[PDB]
Amino acid sequence: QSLQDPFLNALRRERVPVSIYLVNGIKLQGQIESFDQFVILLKNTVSQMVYKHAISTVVPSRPV
Amino acid sequence: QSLQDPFLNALRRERVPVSIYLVNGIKLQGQIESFDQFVILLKNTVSQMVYKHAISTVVPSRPV
Amino acid sequence: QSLQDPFLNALRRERVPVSIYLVNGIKLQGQIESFDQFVILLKNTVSQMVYKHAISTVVPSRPV
Amino acid sequence: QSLQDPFLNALRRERVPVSIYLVNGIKLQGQIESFDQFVILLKNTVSQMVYKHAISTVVPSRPV
Amino acid sequence: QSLQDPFLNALRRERVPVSIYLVNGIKLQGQIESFDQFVILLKNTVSQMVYKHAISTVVPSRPV
Amino acid sequence: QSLQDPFLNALRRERVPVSIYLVNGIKLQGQIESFDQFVILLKNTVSQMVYKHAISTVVPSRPV
RNA sequence: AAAAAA
RNA sequence: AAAAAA
RNA sequence: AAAAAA
């Protein structure tokens, strides 16, 4: 089992806007387009690839 | 045996408010809803997913 | 399936200029010549080898 | 075999006060209460869980 | 296969002066003397051991 | 073959004073008493345990 | 120990 | 989101 | 390349 995947899959399904905060404190904003074991694709004006190892937190702008 | 799971599990069941300190010094506050091998679910205004690799310390508010 | 390889591979073939952001905020600019499991080859004035573990994000200049 | 465990077990056994310095330079102080493969429990006024991956050094306040 | 090793082996063979930038932005300069799976030996006035996990980029002072 | 063990082992036996630089720039000074897969034992006023994952470079004072 | 420098 | 504090 | 911002 897991908990990371159902959490991310939910923000993906529901198109909820998230804030992904990186290990350096930088805050990226957009929507989970998709993800795998090591990365998350984050869509704003463009899709960008975010390595998971650089992520602190994934915060939804509203509950799930 | 494990030490991480029992400690985290006790804060979970006992609804103990914790400060989670990140590798960059930032202090997150809330309660542990659940956790898995790589992430912890922290509830305050909302539930954010916190990656364990970004965590320094998990500090209880009261002794457990 | 993978998500990291197809995304990186598309920027490679389509000669798409990318910004690579490091875990320390520094933005590297250039094009992806190639990559493997642990590193990415980035071309600008020269080819530098960038370790994936030092990468936060890989941001395309145009959508892909 | 190992060397990390006999070292920590000694500071635990002997109740020696230690300084654990984190990767961000922060200095935590207390006594090793216990540890496993990934974390160390550090007792001061409260016990807190310190992930090993966030640790630079474990310095005793006196030789072992 | 790989791509990291042929790249480093080339800078080693050809005695090309490199700049190795660390995850903290510090820039070390010298020549790859040798390397393994986890470290690179960098020769200037003295040889020093650089852990790979602390490296951002390996930049040649001229193309390969 | 390994490269890390022979280099570290030579500084150990030859009692060579080394500077150990952390991923945060801090320079530790002393001598290598011993080391294992994950940690290095550094002696100055006392022996501190230094986690390898927190190390950038190990720099000898004299050539070895 | 900056609830966090797109 | 300092093409980068030997 | 801050022997180290509980």
Residue numbers in the entry:
A (entry chain A), B (entry chain B), C (entry chain B), D (entry chain A), E (entry chain A), F (entry chain B): 5 to 68
Give the original sentences from the paper that presented this experimental model.
The Hfq hexamer (Hfq6) has three distinct RNA binding sites referred to as ‘proximal’, ‘distal’ and ‘lateral’. Crystal structures revealed that the distal site of each Hfq subunit can accommodate a triplet of RNA nucleotides (ARN or AAN) with differing specificities: the A-site binds specifically adenines, the R-site can accommodate both adenine and guanine with preference for A, while the third base points away from Hfq towards the solvent and can be any nucleotide (N). In addition, the distinct specificities of Hfq’s proximal and distal binding sites allow sRNAs and mRNAs to bind simultaneously to opposite faces of a single Hfq hexamer, which increases their local concentration and facilitates annealing. Here, we present a crystal structure of Escherichia coli Hfq in complex with A18 RNA that shows an unanticipated quaternary architecture with two Hfq6:A18 assemblies interacting via their RNA molecules.
